Design a binder for this molecule. Structure first.
Ligand SMILES: NC(=O)C1=CN([C@@H]2O[C@H](COP(=O)(O)OP(=O)(O)OC[C@H]3O[C@@H](n4cnc5c(N)ncnc54)[C@H](OP(=O)(O)O)[C@@H]3O)[C@@H](O)[C@H]2O)C=CC1
Ligand SMILES: CCCCCCCCCCC[C@H](O)CC(=O)SCCNC(=O)CCNC(=O)[C@H](O)C(C)(C)COP(=O)(O)O
Ligand SMILES: [Zn+2]
Lengths: 209, 87, 96, 129, 342, 115, 145
C-alpha cells in the first residue's frame, strides 16, 4: 500500500460520528456548546457545567445512544484558562459499539453535580478528582481523600504543585514515631527544557494575536 | 543636629500636577544654586510621580514636603521655608 | 600509572585527591578508595601513529558496527597529526 | 444569565488557603512573568510565544557524598506556561504570590534589500559574497 | 572553617551542618539521642563501636547516606582512638557503665578511657571535646562511680583545657535505668526505700533536654573550657518521686524500710550475676545519695534551652509498665508529687 | 463577573455559622481523641491547637472559600474519629522534630540567603 | 574583609550610561558564607544599633524609589531636561584646559581585557591578553570537541 507507515483513516466512522454529533447537539442545545470529531475518529461533546447530569442521563438512557458504561472520569489542569480544571467524561456504548467524550470546565471554587446518580462507577472516580485536583462535587455520598495520605495538604496533580512535594517522611528516634519534615532532596530534579524552537506541525499553527 | 544636608525634588516630566515646579526650575533654580553651591539640590525626575520634596537633615532625617500642584511662586516659597533654618 | 598524593592516597585519572585537611576522608578508613589503574589518558599514547598515503582517512574504531560512528580526518597539516575525536587514534601522511 | 442562587462575590479570589502551600513559600517568593528569549545559539522562534511563570532560585549546595546539587526549595523546578500576560498575572495573586512582569520583546521589523549589497554610492556595498 | 565544612542548607538531613562529631560510646542511652540530634542537622558523625554491629543497627537510619560512619574501636588502644578522631571537629565522650565488668571497672571506664580520648584528641587537633560526668561527682563519696567520675573530669580538664564538661544530674527517658529501675522493683515484693527514702533529694533531668544541651554546647562559642551542670527544673524528694512513678504506673506501693548495711548486702547478692546486673552496691549508694545544688556552675538554661519537668514527660517511660487495666489511662490523672524548694 | 454560585453558604453569616459547630465538633472529641490514640500530649494543648488552626484561617473573607475549609475540616474530623489517622498523622500537627526557625532578620542573615 | 555577592548571585539594580535602570536576577547563590551586599550593610547597621528601616528586597527597592524614582522604572529611559540650566551653571567658575593630549586609558585590544576584579581574576581572559601581546604561537590547544 502507498501508506505502509501512515495509520489508515476511516471515513465511514467519521461520517457516522459526525452525524451523531449533530444529533446530540440538536437534542440538548441547552448545554451542548460545541462538538468535534478528531482526526482519529473520536467524538468530543463540550457541555456547560450545569448540563453534567442531564447530558449524561440522555446518553445513558436514550434508545439511540445507550452509553451505559463510564470508562473513566478525569480532569486536565490548565492554569492559563479562567476555569483551570476541565472535567472529562468517557462513556462506552455496548449496544452500538462506540465511545463518546463529554467534557466540562470548572474553576477552583465551584461544585459540580456528582454523576453518582447516573453512573455509580463515578463514585470512586469523583474522590480521585477531588483528591488530586481539588474540584468539589455536591451531592456526593462519601466525598473524601482516596489516594493521598491522611492529613495531606494541597492537591498533587495541580500544575502549580511541585513534583517533589512540600514534605518528606522520616522515622525520628527521639519521638519513636515516623515524622514529617520539609523536603530536602539529596539530588535536585534536573529539569530539562527540550522543546525545539522550530515549529513542529504547521496544521496546528495558532494564528497570531 | 538637623543641619541641611541635601534637598531632593521629584517631579514628573509632563504631568500638570508637576507643571508648577517645572516653571520654578527653569527660572529660579540657577539663582538658588549660586546662593548655596555646597548644597546638593537633587532633581531626580520621573514620569507619573506626585511632585514632592525630600530634605535630608543631619543624623539621617528626612522631611517629606509634598509640592503637589504648587505653582512656581509656591514652590519657591516652600524652598526658602525649608532652608530658612540653617540647622 | 597512578600517582600517590602527599597525604598518602591514590589520585584518580581525573586528578581527584582529597586534601590533607579535608574531613571527607574518614570514609576511606578501613575501606579502599576505588580507583582504576588503566589510565585511558596514558594507554592511548602507546598507540602507534598510523601512516597512510591519502589526504583524508576514515576511522570507525574497528569492528564496524561495534565501533564509534565513522568520521573522516583531514591529514593535511604536516606540522601535527590528525586524531579521531571518538577513539583518539592518530594518523599522519608520510611526508605527504 | 444563570439563576443558581447567585451572590455578590466581588472580593478577589484567594484560593491560597486551599492549595496547601506552607506559609514560607507563599510570601517570600517572588515569581517572574516573562516571555522567554530565543536561545541565541539557534534561530528559531517557536519557544518565545508563551508566557512563563517561574520562582526565584534558592540555595543549592553540594552533598557530602559524591556531591550532586542538593536543594531544599520545592518551588525550584516549577515552571508554568500561560498564553497571555493577563492570564499569567492573574494566576499569581490568585495563588497569592508577589510578582514582577517583563513585557514581551518583539523583534522590530527591519527593512532588508538584496540590491543594497551592491550600492553605487552608499557604504553598505559589501566587499565579499 | 575548611572549604568543605562551611554550613549549608536549612538544617535538614541533606543540609551540611559543618560539624564532624565523633560520639564515643554512642551505642547507648544518650548516644542514641545525641546521634539523632546530630543526624537531623546533617552532621557527619563518626560513631565508634566495640559491640556487635547488629546492636548498632538502630543507629543507621538517623542520618543521610554517608553521614553516619561506623568504626571499630577498643578502649585500651591509642591507635583505635586516633583512627576514629583523626578527622573530626568535635569529639563527644559518652563512655560509661553503672557496674564493674570483669575487664573494665569504674577506674578503667571513667578515668583511663576519658584520659586516652582527651589526650589523643589534643594530639589529633580537634577543636572541642565534650566530656560528660555525673553531677554528684565527688572524690570522697563511697560510691566508686562518683569517685571515679570526679577523678576523670579533673584529668580530662588537665589534658584538654578547653574541653566542655557536662554534669547532668540524672537522666530519665525511654531506656533510662532510673525511672525503669524503680518501676522494675515491683517484682521484688515491695519497694525497699532506704530509710523510707525520706532524706534523699533528687533533681532528675529529661534526656532530650540533655541531648539538645550537648548540641547547643557544640555550636556555642563560649562553651570552650566551661563546666556545665544539667539539672531538671523541679527538685523531688525520693519518697514522693517514687510515689509519682508508681502512681503514673498504677502499681501497688509497698514502702519497705530497709537498713543501709542490709541494702549493701543485697546489692552484693545481685552483683554476682555474670550478665547485666539488676543492681550493684554502687547503684544502691547512688539512689541513696542526694543531688547537691551547684549554682556557681552554669545551668542548662544558659545553653538556650528550657528544661522539661518530669511530670510532663512521665507517661513516656511508665506507659509500658502499666498493665492492661491502665494501659489507656490519660496523662493528667496523676498530679505531680511533693516539690521540695529548689 | 462579580457573581458566582456558592458552595453551601450564601454569605459570610451562614459560612461563619458552619465554622462554629465545626469548632464544636472539634472541641468535644479532643479528650476522646487523646484517649483513643494514646496521645503523649495532654488534653489542654490539644484544644488550643484546634483553636490555633481555626485561628490562622481568619483572613478569609469569601463565602465560597470558607465552605471549602469547612468541608475539608469535616473530613479531617472524620479521619480522626474513625481511627483513619494514626499517632504519626495526629502528631504531624504538632511540629515537634523540626527546629524552630528564627524570625529576626539578623539570625536569617547568619544562617543563609533565605529572604 | 566581608565576603559579598557577585552580580550573578544577587537580584540587583544596575543603571546603564543611558539612564535605563535594569535589574539582574539570582543565577546562583554566593559561594561559601558570602551574603548579599545590601543585607550585609543592613545587618551591620542592626548590630551597630542604628538599624535601617528596610528589611527586604522590596523594602530597599522602595527606599531606592524614595531617593530616586527613576531607579524602579525598569527598562524605561526617563528623559532628563534642563540642559540650559546646567549650561548656565557651568558658565560660573573658570577652569582652564591643559596641553596634555586626550589619551584614552585603553588604546589597543591588549588592555581592553584586564579591567575589573572579575576580569582580572579570570583565567580564560588571561589567555586572551597573552594571545594579543605576543604572536599566535603562544595560544593553541588540541581542540577537538
Ligand atoms: N543518670 C545517668 O546515667 C547519667 C549518666 N551520665 C554518663 O553518660 C554516659 C553514658 O550513659 P548511658 O548512655 O546511660 O550508658 P549506657 O550503659 O546505656 O551506654 C554506655 C555506652 O558506653 C559504652 N561503653 C561503656 N563501657 C565501655 C568500655 N569499657 N569499652 C567500650 N565501650 C564502653 C557502651 O558500649 P556498649 O553498649 O557496647 O556496652 C555504650 O555505648 C556515661 O559516661 C554516664 O556516666 C552522665 C550523667 C547522668
Ligand atoms: C485532635 C488532634 C488534632 C488537633 C488539631 C486539628 C487541626 C485542624 C482542625 C480543623 C481546622 C479547620 O479546617 C478550620 C476551618 O475549616 S476554618 C477556620 C476559621 N476561619 C473562618 O471561619 C474563615 C472566616 N473567618 C472568620 O469568620 C473569623 O476569623 C472568625 C472565625 C474568628 C469568626 O469571626 P466573627 O467573630 O467576626
Ligand atoms: Zn576513532
Amino acid at each position: 500500500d502507498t501508506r505502509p507507515t501512515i495509520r489508515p483513516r476511516n471515513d465511514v466512522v467519521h461520517k457516522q460520528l459526525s452525524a451523531f454529533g449533530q444529533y446530540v447537539a440538536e437534542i440538548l442545545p441547552k448545554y451542548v456548546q460545541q462538538v468535534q470529531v478528531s482526526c482519529f475518529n473520536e467524538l468530543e461533546i463540550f457541555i456547560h457545567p450545569d448540563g453534567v447530569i442531564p447530558v449524561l442521563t440522555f446518553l445513558r438512557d436514550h434508545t439511540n445512544a445507550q452509553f451505559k458504561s463510564l470508562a473513566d472520569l478525569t480532569a486536565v489542569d490548565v492554569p492559563t484558562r479562567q476555569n483551570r480544571f476541565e472535567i472529562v467524561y468517557n462513556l462506552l456504548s455496548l449496544r452500538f459499539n462506540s465511545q463518546i467524550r463529554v467534557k466540562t470546565y470548572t474553576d477552583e471554587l465551584t461544585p459540580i453535580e456528582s454523576s453518582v446518580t447516573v453512573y455509580k462507577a463515578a463514585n470512586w472516580y469523583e474522590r480521585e478528582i477531588w483528591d488530586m485536583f481539588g474540584v468539589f462535587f455536591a451531592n456526593h455520598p462519601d466525598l473524601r481523600r482516596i489516594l493521598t495520605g491522611y492529613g495531606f495538604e494541597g492537591h498533587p496533580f495541580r500544575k502549580d504543585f511541585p513534583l517533589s512535594g512540600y514534605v518528606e517522611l522520616r522515622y525520628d528516634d527521639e519521638v519513636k514515631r515516623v515524622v514529617a519534615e520539609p523536603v530536602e532532596l539529596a539530588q535536585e530534579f534536573r529539569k530539562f527544557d527540550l522543546n525545539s524552537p522550530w515549529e513542529a506541525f504547521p496544521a496546528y499553527r495558532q494564528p497570531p494575536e | 543636629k538637623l543641619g541641611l544636608r541635601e534637598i531632593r525634588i521629584h517631579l514628573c516630566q509632563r504631568s500638570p500636577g508637576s507643571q508648577g515646579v517645572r516653571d520654578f526650575i527653569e527660572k529660579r533654580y540657577v539663582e538658588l544654586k549660586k546662593a548655596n553651591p555646597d548644597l546638593p539640590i537633587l532633581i531626580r525626575e520621573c514620569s507619573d510621580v506626585q511632585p514632592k520634596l525630600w530634605a535630608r537633615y543631619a543624623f539621617g532625617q528626612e522631611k517629606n514636603v509634598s509640592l503637589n500642584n504648587f505653582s512656581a511662586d509656591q514652590v519657591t516659597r516652600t524652598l526658602e521655608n525649608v532652608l530658612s533654618g540653617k540647622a | 600509572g597512578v600517582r600517590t598524593s602527599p597525604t598518602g592516597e591514590k589520585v584518580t585519572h581525573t586528578g581527584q585527591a582529597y586534601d590533607d585537611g579535608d574531613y571527607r576522608r574518614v570514609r576511606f578508613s578501613d575501606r579502599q578508595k576505588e580507583v582504576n589503574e588503566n589510565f585511558a589518558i596514558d594507554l592511548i599514547a602507546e598507540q602507534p601513529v598510523s601512516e597512510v598515503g591519502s589526504r583524508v582517512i576514515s576511522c570507525d574504531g574497528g569492528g564496524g558496527a561495534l565501533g564509534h560512528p565513522r568520521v573522516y580526518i583531514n591529514l593535511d597539516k604536516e606540522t601535527k597529526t590528525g586524531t579521531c575525536g571518538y577513539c583518539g587514534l592518530q594518523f599522519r601522511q608520510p611526508h605527504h | 444569565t444563570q439563576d443558581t442562587q447567585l451572590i455578590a462575590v466581588d472580593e478577589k479570589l484567594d484560593i491560597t488557603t486551599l492549595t496547601g502551600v506552607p506559609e514560607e513559600h507563599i510570601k517570600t517568593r517572588k515569581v517572574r512573568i516573562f516571555v522567554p528569549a530565543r536561545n541565541n545559539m539557534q534561530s528559531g522562534v517557536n519557544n518565545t510565544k508563551k508566557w512563563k511563570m517561574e520562582f526565584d532560585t534558592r540555595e543549592r549546595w553540594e552533598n557530602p557524598l559524591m556531591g550532586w546539587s542538593s536543594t531544599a526549595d520545592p518551588l525550584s523546578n516549577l515552571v508554568l506556561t500561560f498564553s497571555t500576560k493577563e492570564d499569567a498575572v492573574a494566576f499569581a495573586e490568585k495563588n497569592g504570590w508577589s510578582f514582577d512582569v517583563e513585557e514581551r520583546k518583539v523583534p522590530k521589523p527591519k527593512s532588508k534589500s538584496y540590491g543594497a549589497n551592491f550600492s553605487w554610492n552608499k557604504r553598505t556595498r559589501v566587499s565579499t559574497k | 572553617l575548611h572549604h568543605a565544612l562551611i554550613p549549608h542548607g536549612k538544617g535538614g538531613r541533606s543540609s551540611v551542618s559543618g560539624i564532624v562529631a565523633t560520639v564515643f560510646g554512642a551505642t547507648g542511652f544518650l548516644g542514641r539521642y545525641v546521634v539523632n540530634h546530630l543526624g537531623r542537622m546533617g552532621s557527619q558523625v563518626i560513631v565508634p563501636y566495640r559491640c556487635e554491629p547488629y546492636d548498632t543497627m538502630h543507629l543507621r537510619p538517623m542520618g543521610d547516606l554517608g553521614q553516619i560512619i561506623f568504626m571499630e574501636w577498643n578502649g585500651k588502644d591509642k591507635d583505635s582512638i586516633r583512627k576514629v578522631v583523626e578527622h573530626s571537629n568535635v569529639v563527644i565522650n559518652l563512655v560509661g557503665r553503672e557496674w564493674e565488668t570483669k575487664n573494665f571497672d569504674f577506674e578503667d571506664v571513667f578515668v583511663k578511657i576519658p584520659h586516652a580520648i582527651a589526650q589523643v584528641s589534643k594530639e589529633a587537633g580537634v577543636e572541642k571535646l565534650i566530656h560528660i560526668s555525673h553531677l554528684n561527682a565527688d572524690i570522697k563519696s563511697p560510691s566508686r562511680y562518683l569517685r571515679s567520675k570526679a577523678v576523670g573530669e579533673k584529668e580530662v580538664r588537665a589534658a584538654f583545657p578547653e574541653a566542655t564538661i557536662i554534669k547532668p544530674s540524672d537522666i530519665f527517658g525511654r531506656e533510662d535505668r532510673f525511672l525503669n529501675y524503680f518501676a522494675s522493683m515491683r517484682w521484688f515484693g515491695g519497694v525497699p526505700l532506704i530509710s523510707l527514702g525520706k532524706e534523699t533529694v533528687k533533681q532528675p533531668v529529661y534526656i532530650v533536654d540533655v541531648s539538645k544541651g550537648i548540641i547547643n554546647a557544640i555550636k556555642d562559642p563560649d562553651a570552650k573550657g566551661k563546666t556545665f551542670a544539667f539539672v531538671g527544673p523541679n527538685r523531688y524528694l525520693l519518697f514522693d518521686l517514687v510515689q509519682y512513678i508508681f502512681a503514673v504506673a498504677y502499681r501497688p506501693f509497698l514502702p519497705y524500710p530497709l537498713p543501709h548495711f542490709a541494702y549493701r548486702w543485697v546489692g552484693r547478692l545481685f552483683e554476682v550475676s555474670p550478665f547485666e546486673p539488676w543492681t550493684t552496691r554502687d547503684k544502691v549508694e547512688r539512689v541513696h545519695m542526694s543531688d547537691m545544688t551547684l549554682p556557681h556552675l552554669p545551668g542548662l538554661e544558659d545553653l538556650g534551652i528550657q528544661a522539661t519537668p518530669l511530670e510532663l514527660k512521665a507517661i513516656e517511660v511508665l506507659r509500658r509498665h502499666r498493665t492492661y487495666r491502665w494501659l489507656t489511662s490519660e496523662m493528667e490523672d496523676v498530679k505531680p508529687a511533693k516539690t521540695v524548694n529548689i | 463577573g462579580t457573581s458566582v454560585k456558592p458552595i453551601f453558604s450564601r454569605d459570610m453569616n451562614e459560612a461563619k455559622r458552619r465554622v462554629r459547630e465545626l469548632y464544636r465538633a472539634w472541641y468535644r472529641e479532643v479528650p476522646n481523641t487523646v484517649h483513643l490514640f494514646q496521645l503523649d500530649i495532654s488534653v489542654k494543648q490539644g484544644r488550643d491547637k484546634v483553636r490555633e488552626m481555626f485561628m490562622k484561617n481568619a483572613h478569609v473573607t469569601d463565602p465560597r472559600v470558607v465552605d471549602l475549609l469547612v468541608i475539608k475540616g469535616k473530613m479531617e474530623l472524620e479521619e480522626t474519629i474513625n481511627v483513619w489517622k494514626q499517632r504519626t498523622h495526629i502528631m504531624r500537627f504538632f511540629h515537634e522534630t523540626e527546629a524552630p526557625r528564627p524570625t529576626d532578620f539578623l539570625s536569617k542573615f547568619y544562617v543563609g540567603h533565605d529572604p | 574583609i566581608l565576603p559579598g555577592a557577585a552580580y550573578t548571585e544577587k537580584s540587583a539594580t544596575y543603571v546603564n550610561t543611558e539612564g535605563r535602570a535594569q535589574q539582574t536576577k539570582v543565577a546562583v547563590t554566593p559561594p561559601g558564607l558570602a551574603r548579599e551586599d545590601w543585607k550585609i550593610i543592613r545587618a551591620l547597621s542592626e548590630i551597630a544599633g542604628m538599624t535601617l528601616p528596610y528589611d527586604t528586597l522590596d523594602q530597599v527597592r522602595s527606599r531606592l524609589e524614595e531617593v530616586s524614582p527613576n531607579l524602579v522604572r525598569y527598562d524605561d529611559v526617563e528623559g532628563a531636561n534642563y540642559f540650559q540650566q546646567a549650561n548656565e551653571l557651568s558658565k560660573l567658575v573658570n577652569q582652564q584646559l591643559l596641553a596634555d593630549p586626550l589619551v584614552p586609558p585603553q588604546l589597543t585590544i591588549k588592555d581592553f581585557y584586564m579591567t575589573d576584579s572579575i576580569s582580572r581574576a579570570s583565567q580564560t581572559m588571561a589567555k586572551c591578553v597573552k594571545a594579543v601581546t605576543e604572536g599566535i604561537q603562544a595560544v593553541e590547544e588540541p581542540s577537538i570537541c
